[PDB]
Structure 1
Amino acid sequence: SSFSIYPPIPGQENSLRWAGKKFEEIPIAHIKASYNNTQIQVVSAAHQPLAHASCGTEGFRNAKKGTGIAAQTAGIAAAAKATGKGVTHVRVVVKGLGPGRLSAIKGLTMGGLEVISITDNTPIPHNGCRPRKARRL
């Protein structure tokens, strides 16, 4: 039972399939977890948006959508729409560090999507654009 956490790059010849599809054709789920909102967009391998759900789209409010429960609910909401179009496995790509980071990931499983991998694509500039000034002067 030799299992490697490294992704199955297309350059290799490994035989790993999910529901008969290769790792390259499995749809993607971009989860942008900001400090005040969490958005989820499930797209196909061909970069075609299938489902979209955010904490604000569920009837929440300003400070209500910033909690983890809002992200957990948005995960189920996105998973229902993804399953409505015939999606069983998805690759999660997380963007940003927020309170609803793991909440959306587990909400996807609660809503009925099997996560095969978690990708952390957080934008970290190499000292590029200057961010805003610090608070509490």
Structure 2
Amino acid sequence: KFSIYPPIPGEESSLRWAGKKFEEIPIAHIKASHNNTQIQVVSASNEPLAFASCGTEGFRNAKKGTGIAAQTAGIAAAARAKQKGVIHIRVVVKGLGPGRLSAMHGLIMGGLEVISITDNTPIPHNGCRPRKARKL
């Protein structure tokens, strides 16, 4: 038993967490860029609870794009959520850039419980053509 695949918005899945449906549970948007990760927390109706990033917490510069920084950011986000009453979170990932799992970890530490992880990293089906290949 237990499916990997999520419960659809169509009815009726016999699941709740804190007496709430899957769609009702808030989303924590993690934007893992290559040199900073920003972690928003939002309700099901799209009301923002708590923004927090590696810039907002202390760090500046390349030290934004470490895992530790990401973790810290996540923790901060969790803390902010806690005041407003959240507990369980869906997680949504954007991009790659070390602070991606780290953010999640931070969130967990902060006390929020991870319910699901979905990465909507924008993979353009050939859209804009990116920067020229630099000399490393």
What aligned pairs does 1:5-20 form with structure 2 within 5 A after superposition?
Answer: 5-20=4-19
What aligned pairs does 1:93-132 form with structure 2 within 5 A after superposition?
Answer: 93-132=92-131
- 1:57 match: 56
Q: CA deviation at 1:10?
A: 1.5
The AA in structure 1 aligned to 2:130 is P
User: 5+ unaligned residues in a row in structure 2: which ranges?
Assistant: none
- 1:26 match: 25
Q: CA deviation at 1:7?
A: 0.6
Aligned equivalents of 1:15 and 1:134: distance in 2? 50
Aligned equivalents of 2:125 and 2:43: distance in 1? 30
Instruction: Tell me the TM-score normalised to structure 1 length.
Output: 0.97
Moved more, 18-27 or 3-12: 3-12
Aligned equivalents of 1:112 and 1:102: distance in 2? 16
The AA in structure 2 aligned to 1:124 is I
- 2:37 match: 38
- 2:80 match: 81
Aligned equivalents of 1:24 and 1:63: distance in 2? 36
Runs of 4+ in 1 over 4 A off after TM superposition: none
Aligned equivalents of 2:113 and 2:92: distance in 1? 14
User: 5+ unaligned residues in a row in structure 1: which ranges?
Assistant: none
The AA in structure 1 aligned to 2:36 is N
Aligned equivalents of 2:99 and 2:30: distance in 1? 10
Let me know the Cα RMSD of the aligned residues. Answer: 0.9
Q: CA deviation at 1:61?
A: 1.4
The AA in structure 1 aligned to 2:33 is S
Identity of aligned residues (%): 88
Aligned equivalents of 1:135 and 1:66: distance in 2? 20
Q: CA deviation at 1:111?
A: 0.5
Q: CA deviation at 1:60?
A: 0.4
The AA in structure 2 aligned to 1:44 is S
